[PDB]
């Protein structure tokens, strides 16, 4: 069991109806708060571990927005070493409805060290997700 990774929060700017449910609500430790993106499609969020830092990801945990769990199905998690994700690989694809109000934990088996990781939400989701966590270890 590896430590929770920290980094700078990156992703889609803004929030639905400018209420303020920005990407940062997915990293605040509260499963009742959530990211509600300004648009239906294209929303994403993640971390930049910082220049020169690469982690190997061994687990991802996430919790859907309460009452909108189906807006995660089809979302994917990617690791990359370019901030535009053009070199990304998909670490996990959500294909089952995530349980409400808890962190679903998924193992990742990819030995690559990444500087960047994200959740890329499916169309019609407004990026909805309540909490997102990555675990792993410094690439050796």
Ligand X SMILES: OC[C@H]1O[C@H](OC[C@H]2O[C@@H](O)[C@@H](O)[C@@H](O)[C@@H]2O)[C@H](O)[C@@H](O)[C@H]1O
What residue ranges bind Ca ion (CB under 5 A)? 25, 28, 30, 33, 130-131
Nearest CA among 65, 89, 68, 75 for reference residue 119: 75
Nearest residue to ligand X, scored by beta-carbon proximity: 126
Do 97 and 32 touch, CB atoms closer than 8 A? no
- Nearest distance from residue 125's CB to Ca ion, in Å? 16
Q: Which one of Ca ion, ligand X, none is in contact with 69 (Cβ closer than 5 to 8 A by kind)?
A: none
The secondary structure of 117-133 as a DSSP string is: EEEEPPTTSTT-BSEEE
Min CB(125)–ligand X separation in Å: 8
Q: Which of 81, 99, 93 is nearest to 119 (CA)?
A: 93
Q: CA 8, CA 99: separation in Å to the nearest integer? A: 27
Q: Which does 60 bind (CB under 5 to 8 A by kind): Ca ion, ligand X, none?
A: none
Q: How far is the CB of 120 from ligand X (least distance, A)?
A: 17
What is the SS3 assignment for 16?
Answer: helix
Q: Tell me, rounded to whole angstroms, the distance of Cα 57 from its chain centroid.
A: 12
Instruction: Write out the residues near ligand X by the rule CB under 6 A.
Output: 16, 36, 126
Residue nearest to Ca ion (CB): 33
Q: Which is nearer to Ca ion, 33 or 70 (CB)?
A: 33
**Residue with smaller CB distance to ligand X, 15 or 78:** 15
> Residue 47 CB, nearest distance to Ca ion (Å)?
15
């Amino acid at each position: 069991s590896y430590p929770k990774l920290t980094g700078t929060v990156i992703g889609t700017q803004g929030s639905w109806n400018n209420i303020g449910n920005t990407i940062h609500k997915a990293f605040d430790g509260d499963l009742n708060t959530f990211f509600d993106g300004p648009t239906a499609n294209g929303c994403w969020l993640g971390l930049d571990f910082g220049e020169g830092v690469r982690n190997v990801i061994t687990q991802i945990k996430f919790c859907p927005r309460s009452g909108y769990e189906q807006r995660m199905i089809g979302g994917i998690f990617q690791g990359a070493n370019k901030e535009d994700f053009s070199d990304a690989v998909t670490l996990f694809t959500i294909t089952s409805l995530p349980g409400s109000g808890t962190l679903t934990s998924v193992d990742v088996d990819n030995p690559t060290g990444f500087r960047y990781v994200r959740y890329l939400s499916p169309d019609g989701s407004n990026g909805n997700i309540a909490e997102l966590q990555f675990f792993g270890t410094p690439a050796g």
